[PDB]
């Protein structure tokens, strides 16, 4: 009856992801569910350094590109339909949801 359903959230955006994150939490808090979140995960930072020039001339100058990636986790003690009954609100642009059934 009462399972272990984990929702995993990743994105490139701090503000945008916590919009969804908190809404899911307040979504299910209005149902008084056992909501164990959000567990906040170390931010991954993809990186590329490339030489600015297309010809290898001049003072060698480097630009450090990078990408922040943020990792969020929510626990719900609920059903496979109660999870989907909640997680139907408008997912804001780009935010990744990958709910799966944990152990």
């Amino acid at each position: 009856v009462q399972h272990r359903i984990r929702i995993t959230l990743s994105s490139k955006s701090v503000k945008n992801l916590e919009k969804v994150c908190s809404d899911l939490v307040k979504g299910a808090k209005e149902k008084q569910l056992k909501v164990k979140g959000p567990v906040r995960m170390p931010t991954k930072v993809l990186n590329i350094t490339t030489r600015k020039s297309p010809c290898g001339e001049g003072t060698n100058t480097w630009d450090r590109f990078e990408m922040r990636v943020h990792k969020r986790v929510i626990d719900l003690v609920s059903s496979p339909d109660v999870v989907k009954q909640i997680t139907s609100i408008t997912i804001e642009p780009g935010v990744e949801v990958e709910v799966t059934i944990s152990d």
Binding site: I48, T50, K52, D63, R64, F65, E66, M67
Partner: protein, 39 residues
């Protein structure tokens, strides 16, 4: 036998994270992919 997915150049190639871009075509498309130059 590895070239840029954009231009087909054999040099200065970036396989890191699986972009397979040359160091120049990447710079041309860097912000579009979403690599922000924060620093």
């Amino acid at each position: 036998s590895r070239v840029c997915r954009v231009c087909g150049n054999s040099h200065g190639l970036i396989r890191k994270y699986g972009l397979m871009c040359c160091r120049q075509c990447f710079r041309s498309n860097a912000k579009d992919i979403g690599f922000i130059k924060y620093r």
